[PDB]
Amino acid sequence: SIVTKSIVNADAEARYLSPGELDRIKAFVTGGAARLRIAETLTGSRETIVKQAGDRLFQKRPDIVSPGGNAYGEEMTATCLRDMDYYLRLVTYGVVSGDVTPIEEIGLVGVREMYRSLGTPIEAVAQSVREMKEVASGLMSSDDAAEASAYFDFVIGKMS
Amino acid sequence: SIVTKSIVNADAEARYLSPGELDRIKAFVTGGAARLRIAETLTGSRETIVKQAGDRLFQKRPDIVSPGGNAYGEEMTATCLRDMDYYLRLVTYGVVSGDVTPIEEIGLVGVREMYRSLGTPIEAVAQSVREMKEVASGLMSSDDAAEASAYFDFVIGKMS
Amino acid sequence: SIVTKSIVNADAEARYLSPGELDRIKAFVTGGAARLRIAETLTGSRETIVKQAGDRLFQKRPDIVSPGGNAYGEEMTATCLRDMDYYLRLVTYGVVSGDVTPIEEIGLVGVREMYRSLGTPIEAVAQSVREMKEVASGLMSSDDAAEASAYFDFVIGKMS
Amino acid sequence: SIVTKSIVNADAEARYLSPGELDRIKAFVTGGAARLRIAETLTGSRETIVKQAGDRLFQKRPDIVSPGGNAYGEEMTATCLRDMDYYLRLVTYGVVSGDVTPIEEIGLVGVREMYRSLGTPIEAVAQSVREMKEVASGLMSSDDAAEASAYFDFVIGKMS
Amino acid sequence: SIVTKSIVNADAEARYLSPGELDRIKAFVTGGAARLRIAETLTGSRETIVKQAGDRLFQKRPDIVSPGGNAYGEEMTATCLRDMDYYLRLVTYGVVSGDVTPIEEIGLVGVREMYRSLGTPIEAVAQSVREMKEVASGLMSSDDAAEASAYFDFVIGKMS
Amino acid sequence: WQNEVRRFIPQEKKLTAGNPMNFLGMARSINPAANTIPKVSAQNINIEASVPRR
Amino acid sequence: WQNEVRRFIPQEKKLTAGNPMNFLGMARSINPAANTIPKVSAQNINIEASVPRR
Amino acid sequence: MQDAITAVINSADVQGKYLDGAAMDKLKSYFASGELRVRAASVISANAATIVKEAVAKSLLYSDVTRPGGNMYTTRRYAACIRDLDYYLRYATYAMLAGDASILDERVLNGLKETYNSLGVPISSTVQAIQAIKEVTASLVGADAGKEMGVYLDYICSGLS
Amino acid sequence: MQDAITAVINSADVQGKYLDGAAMDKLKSYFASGELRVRAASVISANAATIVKEAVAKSLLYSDVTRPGGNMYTTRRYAACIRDLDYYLRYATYAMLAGDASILDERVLNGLKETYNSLGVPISSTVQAIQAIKEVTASLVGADAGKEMGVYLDYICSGLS
Amino acid sequence: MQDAITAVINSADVQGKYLDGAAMDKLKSYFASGELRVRAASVISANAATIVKEAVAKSLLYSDVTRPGGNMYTTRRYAACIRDLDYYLRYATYAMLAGDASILDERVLNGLKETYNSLGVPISSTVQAIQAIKEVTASLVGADAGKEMGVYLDYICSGLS
Amino acid sequence: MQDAITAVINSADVQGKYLDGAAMDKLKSYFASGELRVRAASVISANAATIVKEAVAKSLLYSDVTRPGGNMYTTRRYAACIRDLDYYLRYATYAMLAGDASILDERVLNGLKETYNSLGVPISSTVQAIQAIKEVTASLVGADAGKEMGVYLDYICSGLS
Numbered sequence A, B, C, D, E: 001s002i003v004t005k006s007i008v009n010a011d012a013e014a015r016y017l018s019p020g021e022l023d024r025i026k027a028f029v030t031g032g033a034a035r036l037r038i039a040e041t042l043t044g045s046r047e048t049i050v051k052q053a054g055d056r057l058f059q060k061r062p063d064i065v066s067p068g069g070n071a072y073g074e075e076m077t078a079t080c081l082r083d084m085d086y087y088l089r090l091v092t093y094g095v096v097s098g099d100v101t102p103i104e105e106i107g108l109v110g111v112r113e114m115y116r117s118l119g120t121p122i123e124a125v126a127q128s129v130r131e132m133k134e135v136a137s138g139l140m141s142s143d144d145a146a147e148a149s150a151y152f153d154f155v156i157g158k159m160s
Numbered sequence F, G: 001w002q003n004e005v006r007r008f009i010p011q012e013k014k015l016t017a018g019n020p021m022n023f024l025g026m027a028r029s030i031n032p033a034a035n036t037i038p039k040v041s042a043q044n045i046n047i048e049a050s051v052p053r054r
Numbered sequence H, I, J, K: 001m002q003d004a005i006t007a008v009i010n011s012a013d014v015q016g017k018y019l020d021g022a023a024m025d026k027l028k029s030y031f032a033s034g035e036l037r038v039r040a041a042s043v044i045s046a047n048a049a050t051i052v053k054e055a056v057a058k059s060l061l062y063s064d065v066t067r068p069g070g071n072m073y074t075t076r077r078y079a080a081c082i083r084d085l086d087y088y089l090r091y092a093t094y095a096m097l098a099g100d101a102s103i104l105d106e107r108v109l110n111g112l113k114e115t116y117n118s119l120g121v122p123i124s125s126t127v128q129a130i131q132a133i134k135e136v137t138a139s140l141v142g143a144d145a146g147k148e149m150g151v152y153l154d155y156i157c158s159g160l161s
């Protein structure tokens, strides 16, 4: 949470919150309604965004599902779609929290190691999450698009 | 080189080279004829060895040559041919030097970073080196095949 | 630039600009409008100016394109034209700057070395620049004609 | 003369006069009428100009004509008036020539040594030429005031 | 003459014409019969040699004799034949003397200035002298050919 | 008389060891067989049993 | 299904400033009139009066 | 380092006076810049690896630099140069967000020329690469934000060379 | 070195193009500066010794700088300081009339800090000298001309420090 | 600087020993090569300008170096490059005639890389131009004299790289 | 660092080519010299302390350095000399075994000159000590095998000069 990040920074400074940190907390608590609305919209429409993004990534990188590939196979495609759903849920967690800390703590720390063990093109995974962000922006309000794209795009950069 | 490796170990321990290390250097210099012969054989069969290895790689992992894969066009396949030629040359350098330090210093440290920047599947690169190892073993004597296979296996393991 | 020219001349004696130099700087800064105007009037006719000048020069001195000649080939005719274009850009630079310093620093110093190395006739290239000047005077205003012909004359005399 | 200065520069460079020098001489020959007007005005109003400037200089520096001073005595104040006449005529020469060559050659080179020999306060002389500048500017037109002021500024700086 | 060159060098070093030069002078004076004979050979065959040299030069560079070129007119060609005659006579002078001092004192110093004032392609003149050298070498016998070729390609390099 | 017309193009520089230009011909000779374009739309797969459970 | 192929050779570069490619076409349009080969013997010229006596 | 706001504050504090309109206007200018700069930073952090990838692909990739003999040769040197460009992009975004280039001198140009000279790094090749990142980032972000990123990257290149 | 006009000329020439609209407006801006620069140069040439005289009298004069221990002691060092000020003023006038600091940083900053350190020169005292030069020049040239002169002198001071 | 004879003499002197069999053999080898070197030097003196012209034409024309942006742009820079190549040819001929590279080491290589880095000129392009001069010289002189010139030219390239 | 084998490998890798006949010939030459190198290295390792003992005895003992106030006074400093001479001998043996004197540059001569200049260590005295080491080791391992040890100790001395 943004409050968790602010309190961590304040503790590292060994004193109470700064005016900037208190302003951040106030703004986040004010905008929590819009943030929760965005999270609920993404959660409700999640299967649509994940499905469309997966299909679009399939067209972008046919190698992923071609024979001899990590995603090749019905079960492998299902596994990749499960990964897409997990990462969408993580982005929802980040949106509700207000900071990318839950994102990193859940699905970005060691993700390179895990996908190296699984033999996966993490760049293609970044393309998949890009498609997820695009579908969410398409089927979400323009104002909400900025907040959703910020966290989706942090995920894209971290796992790119 | 074996000499450089033993020298570095002795320098790290702040001591002269031990009698065992001197014996190893003496054995290496005496047996150098076989290593030079192996390097000569690999350099001679460089063309056919790389061609067969790359071809077998292509039907072994067609995704790399597939659309969307890293090496799809003939130009990118040529880039793979150049990479496999590089690694064959490095293996020959290691064979002549008697130690894996030249290979590690030339194309093993930061190879993961290079292939992540290029988008290349390092697992597929390791598979290509494995195919070159198989074709070289076919083209060499059993004991000579083992001596070269030591360095091929080292490169493959470091890549993987 | 006449600015830098008078600056260097004054610095040679380690003193500020004389009344004559400051007066000429007055005149140049005042007439910069007409100078830039002649700049557009010559920069707009570049294709026609070079085409007409080179065409006229070709029958002025047919030896340039005659067999065994300097620019007998089609490629060398085009190269001679491209030199014409360079020198016209340089004269445009000089006319805008108000001083022949850009001409000297770009396309006059060592040009005899250039054209003895490449065998091209300096008298012929001077005649080409004369043709450029004639066409420019024809296609521009009268006062602008004299103003641009001053620098065309300088380059023609200096190179020739 | 600026014509002589340009000729000196051209002969030093071993080249014919550049467009800058040509434009400079053209502007000088066209402005020669106004220059001769200024010279005629200065010659006509010389005595009033010199007397008013000398009296302003006296008010600025009374010690110059005080007892024990260089200008003390009617002889040694008439000699100041004569020197001011000389410098005013030199400024007229410089105005009619367009350059500072005659001024530097007749009143500026060796002037410090002469005034060291005679004990004169060259700083006081600079103040006197300044006062002559204001008096001539008052008696003279505004547009030519800047032109005359340029040469007065030159003399003031050099003899300062 | 070789003796004159040796005298100049010895005077420059304030010497007495050391044996390393005295023996060279002795060898030259003893072998002068061959140099003289080559002189009469070139003098007798000057007309023919000049004729084939001009033929080859015009074949290689027809533009120079073209109306655009300098040699056109049936009298400019005659003047080229005349200049080739001068150069052949100079080379004969140099051969009889033993060094290139008459060569450079008659027709190499300022040759670039002369041919620039005449518009002549000095590089074409060098090609003509090359053709003359080849004709003379064909006309004479081996070692005499090399002895003349020394002066010939000296003139060639100086012209170039 | 032949008068070889000099051309615009600069003379080509020779290939070096690291250039892939010397391997383009080898790649053409190999002629790798590209994988057939995939047809999996994935719209018919539900993420409930398709994902393995071992 | 665009599947753009990645080419490593630099493609045909656009004619930048100063390229004679930029003027080759208009040189064609100019079409210089090459002078014909002169027919001069250079062997029958009596060089004693053809040289001007000016 | 210091942002444009801190630069104005320091200029005011040197005189030990309050902020006046001559600083108020520039503060308004930086604030108006504002969302543009933050969006450019967001997009750059978005495709952080991508600009480096295409810039290296266009400038140094498939050339003598990455060939044997060239300083980009060997995977270790390759990763080293890629890490250096990651430095350059991160510090350029830092300077853009702050509105001042002080971070480059205090963090980037401090000793970098001498260290590359000791390492025998091709300064011209590095400059060309960084220019490639500049134009790639401009194309990725837009005209204005691309312009600020380009000016910061060109300051980096000028200091390096 | 170079000024604004030669800067636009060679910026065009390096890309090998004629004068585009940006160059035209840059040249128009420099021409508009024009007579203001020439007038400031003429007035400076008028009172050349003046600005240095009152700048010394303001900042350096009557202080430990001109006292024993200070670098201004002895008539030789005093006249050396005056000569340095005259160099700085002439270069400032040249840079003003040109429009660029290339003349300065090619004729000033090259080895100047190290030579003054070798002579043990007070950089702070020098900077104060150029400052007093700046105000004395401003009081004789006006507001905008004085401002640009002060900008050039401040660049000189930054290079010196 | 030292030819083969002087190098042998100086080496023997530094050992403080007379000219033994090895030194005599080396001097005899140089004497045998003397006529070849003399004829090659004469030929290169005859065709010096043509060699550089052809090498430049076949190596360094109609490329980015010649075009604006390349360091060979403008008559000044092109003449500087041509003079550099002429210097390389003449000094390589000197080294060939003397049978030693000390003249190149003390008159050419020293500071060459430093000046090239300072002026930003293409060391790779210079190396390629030296190559082209090598082929032209080999063609003009012959096989063995061509190799003798080429070894020194490649030494120049190695030092410059 | 580097050796004969690594030198050949790097020579091939700089142009990226494989190992041709010349490289294999050089490697065979090194392998032939390997027996001599191992013999000399083992002998010098066995007699390392002795060699420095007689070098110090015949080069430095009973002299100004050892006398009170001398740099070799103050037994800690004497032990420092013993350790430094042992370092020189060990790294010279390293260079002899490797066949290339790059380990000396990157592990012995790196900062040694500055070290001695800052510490007041007599460079010429150290050079004489190293020469005595060379004589002792040459007498200990013969003329041929001692030749390489002398070459590398001479390299150390020249670098320290």
Ligand SMILES: *[C@@H](C)[C@H]1/C(=C/c2[nH]c(/C=C3N=C(/C=C4\NC(=O)C(CC)=C4C)C(C)=C\3CCC(=O)O)c(CCC(=O)O)c2C)NC(=O)[C@@H]1C
Residues within 6 Å of the ligand: A057, A064, A070, A071, A072, A076, A077, A079, A080, A081, A083, A086, A106, A107, A111, A114, A118, A120, A121, A122, A123, A124, A125, A126, A128
């Ligand atoms: C499809 C376009 C992309 C792709 C995906 C893909 N992933 C897997 C397998 C796994 N993915 C994960 C990752 C996670 N599991 C978690 O619980 C979380 C925590 C947030 C993450 C990030 C794991 C662990 C697996 C292994 C199975 C498992 O979940 O236990 C596959 C199949 C791999 C296989 O062989 O089974 C695929 C295809 N692969 C691509 O190439 C695309 C970029």
Ligand SMILES: *[C@@H](C)[C@H]1/C(=C/c2[nH]c(/C=C3N=C(/C=C4\NC(=O)C(CC)=C4C)C(C)=C\3CCC(=O)O)c(CCC(=O)O)c2C)NC(=O)[C@@H]1C
Residues within 6 Å of the ligand: K061, K062, K063, K066, K067, K072, K073, K074, K075, K078
């Ligand atoms: C008899 C008392 C014992 C003995 C002594 C001995 N010493 C040497 C030689 C040297 N002794 C020193 C000692 C020092 N130098 C210092 O700076 C300090 C600090 C006080 C000390 C203790 C040194 C430096 C030398 C050699 C250099 C020199 O003498 O100038 C010898 C001679 C050995 C030789 O081979 O020359 C002897 C005999 N030896 C014994 O066996 C007794 C126990």
Ligand SMILES: *[C@H](C)[C@H]1/C(=C/c2[nH]c(/C=C3N=C(/C=C4\NC(=O)C(CC)=C4C)C(C)=C\3CCC(=O)O)c(CCC(=O)O)c2C)NC(=O)[C@@H]1C
Residues within 6 Å of the ligand: B057, B064, B069, B070, B071, B076, B077, B079, B080, B081, B082, B083, B086, B106, B107, B114, B118, B120, B121, B122, B124, B125, B128, G006, G008, H061, H062, H063, H066, H067, H068, H072, H073, H074, H075, H078
């Ligand atoms: C082929 C079967 C696999 C593959 C390879 C591939 N590589 C590239 C491009 C490059 N590869 C390298 C590698 C090296 N350079 C070195 O110096 C060393 C040895 C010390 C290595 C290993 C480099 C530097 C490049 C860049 C180009 C260049 O050579 O200068 C490509 C093309 C990448 C692109 O986008 O153009 C490819 C295809 N890729 C696969 O997917 C296969 C598993």
Ligand SMILES: *[C@H](C)[C@H]1/C(=C/c2[nH]c(/C=C3N=C(/C=C4\NC(=O)C(CC)=C4C)C(C)=C\3CCC(=O)O)c(CCC(=O)O)c2C)NC(=O)[C@@H]1C
Residues within 6 Å of the ligand: C064, C070, C071, C076, C077, C079, C080, C081, C083, C084, C086, C106, C107, C111, C114, C118, C120, C121, C123, C124, C125, C126, C128, F006, J061, J062, J066, J067, J068, J073, J074, J075, J078
């Ligand atoms: C045309 C009016 C005359 C003529 C021209 C001619 N020039 C060349 C070749 C070159 N000319 C140059 C000169 C420059 N390049 C520059 O960038 C500049 C500086 C601004 C100058 C002055 C150069 C460098 C070349 C060769 C390389 C290049 O083209 O870039 C040729 C052809 C030479 C060849 O042998 O290829 C010709 C024909 N020739 C005439 O007869 C006219 C009088």
Ligand SMILES: *[C@H](C)[C@H]1/C(=C/c2[nH]c(/C=C3N=C(/C=C4\NC(=O)C(CC)=C4C)C(C)=C\3CCC(=O)O)c(CCC(=O)O)c2C)NC(=O)[C@@H]1C
Residues within 6 Å of the ligand: E057, E064, E069, E070, E071, E076, E077, E079, E080, E081, E082, E083, E084, E086, E087, E106, E107, E108, E114, E118, E119, E120, E121, E122, E124, E125, E128
């Ligand atoms: C012919 C292949 C080339 C050529 C030559 C050419 N020269 C002239 C005219 C003159 N030449 C000289 C002088 C000399 N020629 C010599 O050989 C020497 C010997 C040392 C000298 C001093 C002079 C003075 C003239 C003109 C006056 C005179 O002839 O006495 C011409 C005629 C030029 C004209 O227009 O009259 C020619 C053709 N020109 C080429 O283009 C060829 C490459």
Ligand SMILES: *[C@H](C)[C@H]1/C(=C/c2[nH]c(/C=C3N=C(/C=C4\NC(=O)C(CC)=C4C)C(C)=C\3CCC(=O)O)c(CCC(=O)O)c2C)NC(=O)[C@@H]1C
Residues within 6 Å of the ligand: H065, H070, H071, H072, H073, H077, H080, H081, H082, H084, H085, H087, H107, H108, H112, H115, H119, H121, H122, H125, H126, H129
């Ligand atoms: C890349 C643009 C070019 C290139 C360069 C190159 N760099 C290195 C090594 C290093 N680069 C740095 C630079 C920095 N470190 C910092 O902290 C900063 C700012 C944050 C900078 C700019 C450093 C310190 C090193 C050495 C340590 C390291 O590797 O991290 C190399 C390799 C050097 C070597 O072999 O030791 C190279 C080659 N190479 C190219 O081809 C490009 C033109």
Ligand SMILES: *[C@H](C)[C@H]1/C(=C/c2[nH]c(/C=C3N=C(/C=C4\NC(=O)C(CC)=C4C)C(C)=C\3CCC(=O)O)c(CCC(=O)O)c2C)NC(=O)[C@@H]1C
Residues within 6 Å of the ligand: I057, I061, I062, I063, I066, I067, I072, I073, I074, I075, I078
């Ligand atoms: C008095 C006999 C004459 C006179 C004097 C006068 N001097 C000043 C000001 C200064 N004089 C000096 C001179 C020196 N300082 C040194 O260190 C050395 C060598 C040790 C010398 C020669 C200096 C430096 C100054 C400036 C002030 C200072 O010292 O800090 C003035 C006043 C100038 C002003 O504008 O304030 C005067 C009047 N004047 C006469 O007319 C007498 C003949």
Ligand SMILES: *[C@H](C)[C@H]1/C(=C/c2[nH]c(/C=C3N=C(/C=C4\NC(=O)C(CC)=C4C)C(C)=C\3CCC(=O)O)c(CCC(=O)O)c2C)NC(=O)[C@@H]1C
Residues within 6 Å of the ligand: I060, I065, I070, I071, I072, I077, I080, I081, I082, I083, I084, I085, I087, I088, I107, I108, I112, I115, I119, I121, I122, I125, I126, I127, I129
């Ligand atoms: C005076 C303004 C300040 C000062 C300085 C100071 N300078 C010197 C001596 C020299 N100053 C220079 C500097 C330049 N010479 C140039 O040509 C240029 C550019 C045109 C510069 C910047 C030089 C070269 C010298 C030494 C040579 C000489 O005398 O001309 C001194 C004297 C040092 C000495 O050891 O004698 C001083 C004191 N000191 C101050 O306190 C002032 C703020």
Ligand SMILES: *[C@H](C)[C@H]1/C(=C/c2[nH]c(/C=C3N=C(/C=C4\NC(=O)C(CC)=C4C)C(C)=C\3CCC(=O)O)c(CCC(=O)O)c2C)NC(=O)[C@@H]1C
Residues within 6 Å of the ligand: J065, J070, J071, J072, J076, J077, J078, J080, J081, J082, J084, J085, J087, J091, J107, J108, J109, J112, J115, J119, J121, J122, J123, J124, J125, J126, J129
């Ligand atoms: C031509 C093949 C390449 C090229 C050349 C080039 N060089 C310079 C400038 C200099 N080159 C040198 C080098 C030497 N001068 C010597 O006398 C010797 C001794 C043997 C050497 C090696 C120097 C000293 C300079 C600077 C001084 C000078 O006036 O030349 C330039 C011009 C650089 C400039 O800014 O003027 C050029 C163009 N450039 C290329 O692009 C070619 C690959």
Ligand SMILES: CC1=C(/C=C/C(C)=C/C=C/C(C)=C/C=C/C=C(C)/C=C/C=C(C)/C=C/C2=C(C)C(=O)CCC2(C)C)C(C)(C)CCC1=O
Residues within 6 Å of the ligand: A066, A067, A068, A069, A072
């Ligand atoms: C594409 C791709 C792959 C997938 C690869 C795939 C799909 C591989 C699958 C290959 C298949 C389908 C192999 C089956 C082989 C069958 C054999 C050997 C049976 C022979 C029977 C015999 C001799 C019996 C004979 C008999 C006997 C003797 C009797 O007694 C009488 C009866 C009978 C006739 C039966 C990988 C997984 C590799 C990687 C990922 C990837 O993408």
Ligand SMILES: CC1=C(/C=C/C(C)=C/C=C/C(C)=C/C=C/C=C(C)/C=C/C=C(C)/C=C/C2=C(C)C(=O)CCC2(C)C)C(C)(C)CCC1=O
Residues within 6 Å of the ligand: D067, D068, D069, D072
């Ligand atoms: C014996 C005897 C006699 C007596 C005779 C006697 C002894 C007569 C004595 C005569 C004497 C000595 C007269 C002195 C006159 C001096 C004057 C006017 C000073 C002028 C200087 C000035 C104005 C200064 C000017 C200055 C200024 C301000 C400057 O600006 C420049 C400097 C300077 C310093 C020059 C009699 C004749 C009476 C008869 C009877 C008898 O018994």
